[PDB]
């Protein structure tokens, strides 16, 4: 349990899409950054990500700035990094990422793979947590990513929705 409502997602094997990127970053780091955010979540559940290249996935990855067509805009560089729809049809699920930051893969703002994973807690059902050692804290910090696995309260969470 925990967003307002419990939204989940009724089967645990979900597709993503990554639909554009950004210049910060080449491609592929990117494509890991996502992928090892997906894998944090996996490795606590019996989610299984499944990405697909072009067409419909249960959640889309993009890089967009300022208004973006779903009435929540961006705030250029720094404030707002990126956000993310609860668990449903179209865009439920879905992770938006601010274009105007500079990505990362590093200890300089802003890190693509701890913004991404704490985004898809939210994509799969999680809010807040007032932990303030948790993934699912409301505010941005870096932490080291080269072995990174979830926080014990964030895997609390991700349990107590899907087991
Ligand atoms: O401005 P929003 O309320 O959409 C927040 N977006 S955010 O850019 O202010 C934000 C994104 C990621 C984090 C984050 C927290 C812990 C670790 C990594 C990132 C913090 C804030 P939310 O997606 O957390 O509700
Ligand atoms: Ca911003
Ligand atoms: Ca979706
Ligand atoms: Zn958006
Ligand atoms: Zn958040």
Same mark, same amino acid.
């Given at each position: 349990?925990?967003?307002?409502?419990?939204?989940?997602?009724?089967?645990?094997?979900?597709?993503?899409? &990554?639909?554009?990127?950004?210049? %910060?970053?080449?491609?592929?780091?990117?494509?890991? *950054?996502?992928? #090892? /955010?997906? +894998?944090? !979540?996996?490795?606590?559940?019996?989610?299984?990500?499944?990405?697909?290249?072009?067409?419909?996935?249960?959640?889309?990855?993009?890089?967009?700035?300022?208004?973006?067509?779903?009435?929540?805009?961006?705030?250029?560089?720094?404030? &707002?990094?990126?956000?993310?729809? %609860?668990?449903?049809?179209?865009?439920?699920?879905? *992770?938006?990422? #601010? /274009?105007? +930051?500079? !990505?990362?893969?590093?200890?300089?703002?802003?890190?693509?793979?701890?913004?991404?994973?704490?985004?898809?807690?939210?994509?799969?059902?999680?809010?807040?947590?007032?932990?303030?050692?948790?993934?699912?804290?409301?505010?941005?910090?870096?932490?080291?990513?080269?072995?990174?696995?979830?926080?014990?309260?964030?895997?609390?969470?991700?349990?107590?929705?899907?087991?």
């Amino acid at each position: 349990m925990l967003t307002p409502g419990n939204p989940k997602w009724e089967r645990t094997n979900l597709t993503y899409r &990554i639909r554009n990127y950004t210049p %910060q970053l080449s491609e592929a780091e990117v494509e890991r *950054a996502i992928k #090892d /955010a997906f +894998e944090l !979540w996996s490795v606590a559940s019996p989610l299984i990500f499944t990405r697909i290249s072009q067409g419909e996935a249960d959640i889309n990855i993009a890089f967009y700035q300022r208004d973006h067509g779903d009435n929540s805009p961006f705030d250029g560089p720094n404030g &707002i990094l990126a956000h993310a729809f %609860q668990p449903g049809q179209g865009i439920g699920g879905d *992770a938006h990422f #601010d /274009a105007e +930051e500079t !990505w990362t893969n590093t200890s300089a703002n802003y890190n693509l793979f701890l913004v991404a994973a704490h985004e898809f807690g939210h994509s799969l059902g999680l809010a807040h947590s007032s932990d303030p050692g948790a993934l699912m804290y409301p505010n941005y910090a870096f932490r080291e990513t080269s072995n990174y696995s979830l926080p014990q309260d964030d895997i609390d969470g991700i349990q107590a929705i899907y087991g």
